[PDB]
């Protein structure tokens, strides 16, 4: 597919909306050393002194995991600090943002897409997280009382609540839909959305007249894609596979941990005091040491699994953060990085422990090859196009942009003269229309 006298240019263009889901954080947890090792024991100073080192190491690892998760979610969801109020209007030049813009009427202050994501992503009722949430009672004074039941197992609340994440997402949506985002600082000057989209088309290499002559078509395509994405998310269960899989993995890890907690292993009973009460001290020592070793091994397996999951989630959160930095806050020059085609805009939305990007993609289609000539000779003087290339439709010659087919007649304003026709190789004989000639001839 190579030629020395032909050029291939697109003829038609399409606008698509793609959804990219990326997890950003998990459910933080911690274990109490003074209660996991000790348990329901009247005196456990010697046991604590014997077995506190590994418990402290595991607690430090859990603290590191929690701080890494909090740092990741803060980095991915607090890139911009400046904010301003929401736009009351929902339509901007025919584009419908009802599913994206939050609805102030609903008390949840969320979007229909966000509401669907929250409803379709839940947690198992028969889980440790749900029981801990029910027993917490929305008070920090009762944390220890319920932690005694779970032997120090606690769920650390996230640093940023759902309301803060929703507010940040709404502010980002406002800053993207209206005005714009500069490379740093904060929001840019106010500008109508069609003009911003025309600027984006100019950035990707398409003249704004294409948008202005096809505003209705692109608006209809965007509305259809927005309407279809909700149905695709609601119907297809595999769309939200990543977040649901992560939640289920965390839930099953916690469930197997708490199940192994109640296991008696190889002792008379799980009660530490009963072993020493019903047995002599020398035998009770090993009968408790075996239980301690089993619990420590189970906790080590849980913490190493949590470390692996935390590393994976950290990688995913870094990918999400760099995607937001490159595509959400500004136009991205990379091809197929945000979608499949040319990235135009991104509309982030929040989901339980995740962020969804609605990438807008420009896709050329109907590529056609036409004969091209480097220069045109009219009156023994080479003419070169100011911005574009010469394309022949088979019988006539026109000047067209590289990235689109816009046949325009040859005029003295679209071309400039330089040199003679003999020096240039590939000269083609054609007539260059001068608009002054008919006006001067009309006088006669």
């Amino acid at each position, epitope marked *: 597919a190579c030629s020395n006298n032909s050029i291939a240019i697109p003829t038609n263009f399409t606008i698509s909306v793609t959804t990219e889901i990326l997890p950003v954080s998990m459910t933080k947890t*911690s274990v109490d050393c003074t209660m996991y090792i*000790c348990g329901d024991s009247t*005196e456990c*100073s010697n046991l604590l002194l014997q077995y506190g080192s590994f418990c402290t190491q595991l607690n430090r690892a859990l*603290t590191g995991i929690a*701080v890494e998760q909090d740092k990741n979610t803060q980095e991915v969801f607090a890139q911009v600090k400046q904010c301003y109020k929401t736009p009351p209007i929902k339509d901007f030049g025919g584009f419908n943002f009802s599913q994206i813009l939050p609805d102030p009427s609903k008390p949840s202050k969320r979007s229909p897409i966000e509401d669907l994501l929250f409803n379709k992503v839940t947690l198992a009722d028969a889980g440790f997280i749900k029981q801990y949430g029910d027993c917490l009672g929305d008070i920090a004074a009762r944390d220890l009382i319920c*932690a005694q039941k779970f032997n120090g197992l606690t769920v650390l609340p996230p640093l940023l609540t759902d309301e803060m994440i929703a507010q940040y997402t709404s502010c980002l949506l406002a800053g993207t839909i209206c005005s714009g985002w500069t490379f740093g600082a904060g929001p840019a000057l106010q500008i109508p959305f069609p003009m911003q989209m025309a600027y984006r088309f100019n950035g990707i290499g398409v003249t704004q007249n294409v948008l202005y002559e096809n505003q209705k078509l692109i608006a209809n395509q965007f509305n259809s894609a927005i309407g279809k994405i909700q149905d695709s998310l609601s119907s297809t269960p595999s769309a939200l596979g990543k977040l649901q899989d992560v939640v289920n993995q965390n839930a099953q890890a916690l469930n197997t941990l708490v199940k192994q907690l109640s296991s008696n292993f190889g002792a008379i009973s799980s009660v530490l005091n009963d072993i020493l009460s019903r047995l002599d001290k020398p035998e009770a020592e090993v009968q408790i040491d075996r239980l301690i070793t089993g619990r420590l091994q189970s906790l080590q397996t849980y913490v190493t699994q949590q470390l692996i999951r935390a590393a994976e989630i950290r990688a995913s959160a870094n990918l999400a953060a760099t995607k937001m930095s490159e595509c959400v806050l500004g136009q991205s020059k990379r091809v197929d990085f945000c979608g499949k085609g040319y990235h135009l805009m991104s509309f982030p939305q929040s989901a339980p422990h995740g962020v969804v990007f609605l990438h807008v993609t420009y896709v050329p289609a109907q590529e056609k090859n036409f004969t091209t000539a480097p220069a045109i000779c009219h009156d023994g003087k080479a003419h070169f196009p100011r911005e574009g290339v010469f394309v022949s439709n088979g019988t006539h010659w026109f000047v067209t942009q590289r990235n689109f087919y816009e046949p325009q007649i040859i005029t003295t304003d679209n071309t400039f003269v330089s040199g003679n026709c003999d020096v240039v190789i590939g000269i083609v004989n054609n007539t260059v229309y001068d608009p002054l000639q008919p006006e001067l001839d009309s006088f006669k």
Partner: antibody
Amino acid sequence: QVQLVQSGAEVRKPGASVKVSCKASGYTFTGYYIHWVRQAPGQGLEWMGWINPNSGGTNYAQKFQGWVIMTRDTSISTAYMELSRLTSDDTAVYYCARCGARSYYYDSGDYCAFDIWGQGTVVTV
Amino acid sequence: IRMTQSPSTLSVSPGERATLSCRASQSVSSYLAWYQHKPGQAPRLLVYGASTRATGIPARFSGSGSGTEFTLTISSLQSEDFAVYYCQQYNNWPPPFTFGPGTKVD
């Protein structure tokens, strides 16, 4: 409303038992670790140990191991510290404090700093 | 673990910023707290953690530092700020909770 009340100053002969009672008011007695500290005249502060009012677990330091017995009474919400083998070097002021000020984020229940203290009981040999 | 404070005493006029340094033999991370003990009153918590202040503590008190070295600063010395300052470490390892030697102010 939260307050910690300690017993008054008491004097005991050497090689005797001293019972110091610490009472808590304004909050639920269970669910918060209670620690004891000793301030010697002209010296620093030494952490004697701690007791869990919920279960009853007592952990003491190596120096104070055996000499100190900590008991709890959730019915009236009182922590009793009983000393044994009163030595002439035990003359100090004993304070009971509640471990709190916990960072609800990034931290677990074990790591805490005392926020409310008692009044202080002075013992003389 | 050993905790050492500096200096032993200060002579600061009222309404003047003052600072006190504290250090440990090994790394302590953010498990350090500052306590103010009056001669006739029980010690009270002023700053817990690296720089977080306790409830009811005025903004004049502040804390800084990390690793093994921390510092406590006061914007203006007043009559209520005439007590002894102690450093308390609540790190689980080692199990003992070593206190600070103490520092007087004037």
